[PDB]
């Protein structure tokens, strides 16, 4: 099993620096060359830096030259990207894939990324608002209910209905970011009579601010 | 940079059906030295780091199921699944591996055919709790439509609206091949209460005319 295992990708303020490591097994690291590759939030991935099998030959894009340096360590048998002077657009997941030496066939072996997030934003907890209709039966005679989580930073929150007991009905629309802070929403749907008779409650956890909160959807 | 263009950003697909996808280069990727175009195709699933299916345009990886044929040479290139499976619905990329900077191609995402459905739009007023702080977001959920091609148009009192709409959308859903949208218009309490009707108008392939969801304070 070849194994590339990354570390270092934290949430640092822009202008800061971050170092990332990547561990190698199942081959002699010394024989092959390493690369670093980032996958951005809209999911295009872009080559950060490429080295050789002992060093010397260091390669980067113009986005990266000056700030980032790719390193090697053949006894500690580890690959590092020193990232420095961080722009926000650097925010990406960083994968250490490797260079296929003998064969020439891409990056067939990727570690499982280390998410680099650079923001000057600071941790603000969410605002969980219970969104009940002025009672609208949706499908069959159903009723759509909903929760909106406004104004949290960093990530993630996690959003259930009756503690995951209610798994059906619900769609949860991804996090998206308003004032450089995020927003998430979901619709639990049940057939009318459940609501308002039977409890339906939105629970929300934002682990970086320590907030668990739960909001009962409710007429009066 | 040698620039890789992927098309289309998406491709619908039934199953057991042949699909082709493309990539193109500004320059060419082919060297005479070795005798190979160095365009490598990748496949990706959420959670999953992309993996090599074809390398050198044409040559399939170890393990890559034989439906996966390579082609394309020079500057336009092709990725061809002879018979697509659930297990093949994923984003596929392409890459200049020929010369630095190694550039990849934007993305082509497989999402599979389903029969037409229109959304179950649902509008929601700002929770009072919101207004008690000075803000007022109207949530209009929009569910279970298919295709993904949909408008949503907020309108305050018949006049159209644009500033203050944030919209999350889901992926295609695995149980039923449906997508969902949430449009939300965030005003302040003050603008909210110099107003009366609100609408989220909605156009879709099925929508003969646009589904409207008004409330009204």
């Amino acid at each position: 099993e070849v194994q590339l295992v990354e570390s270092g990708g934290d949430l640092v303020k822009p202008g800061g620096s971050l170092k990332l490591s990547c561990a190698a097994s199942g081959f002699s690291f010394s024989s092959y060359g390493m690369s670093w590759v980032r996958q951005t939030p809209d999911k295009r991935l872009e080559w950060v830096a490429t080295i050789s099998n002992g060093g010397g030959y260091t390669y980067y894009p113009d986005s990266v030259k000056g700030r980032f340096t790719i390193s090697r360590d053949n006894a500690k048998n580890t690959l590092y990207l020193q990232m420095s002077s961080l722009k926000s657009e650097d925010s990406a997941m960083y994968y250490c894939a490797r260079r296929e030496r003998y064969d020439e066939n891409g990056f067939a072996y990727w570690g499982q990324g280390t998410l680099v997030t650079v923001s000057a934003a600071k941790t603000t907890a969410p605002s969980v608002y219970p969104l009940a209709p002025v009672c609208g039966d949706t499908t069959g005679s159903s009723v759509t209910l909903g929760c909106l989580v406004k104004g949290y930073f960093p990530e993630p929150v996690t959003l259930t209905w009756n503690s995951g007991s209610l798994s059906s009905g619900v769609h949860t629309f991804p996090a998206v970011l308003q004032s450089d802070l995020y927003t998430l929403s979901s619709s639990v749907t049940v057939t009318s009579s459940t609501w308002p008779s039977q409890s339906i409650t939105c629970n929300v956890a934002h682990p970086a601010s320590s907030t668990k909160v739960d909001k009962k959807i409710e007429p009066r | 940079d040698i620039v890789m263009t992927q098309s289309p950003s998406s491709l619908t697909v039934t199953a057991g059906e042949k699909v082709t996808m493309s990539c193109t280069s500004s320059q060419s990727l082919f060297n005479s030295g070795k005798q190979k175009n160095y365009l490598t195709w990748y496949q990706q699933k959420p959670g999953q780091p992309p993996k090599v299916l074809i390398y050198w345009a044409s040559t399939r990886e170890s393990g890559v199921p034989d439906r996966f044929t390579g082609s394309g040479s020079g500057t336009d290139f092709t990725l061809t699944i002879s018979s697509v499976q659930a297990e093949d619905l994923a984003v596929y990329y392409c890459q200049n591996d020929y010369s630095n900077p190694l550039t990849f191609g934007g993305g082509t995402k497989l999402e599979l055919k389903r029969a037409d459905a229109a959304p179950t739009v649902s509008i929601f007023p700002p929770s009072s709790e919101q207004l008690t702080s000075g803000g007022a977001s109207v949530v209009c959920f929009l569910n279970n439509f298919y295709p993904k091609d949909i408008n949503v148009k907020w309108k305050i009192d018949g006049s159209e609206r644009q500033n203050g709409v944030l919209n999350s959308w889901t992926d295609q859903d695995s149980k039923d091949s449906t997508y969902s949208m949430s449009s939300t218009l965030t005003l302040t309490k003050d603008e909210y209460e110099r107003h009366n009707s609100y609408t989220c108008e909605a156009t879709h392939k099925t929508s003969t005319s646009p589904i409207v969801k008004s409330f009204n304070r």
Binding site: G33, Y59, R101 | -
Partner: peptide
Amino acid sequence: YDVPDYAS
């Protein structure tokens, strides 16, 4: 013998 990357 550090070898130049094949994409160099």
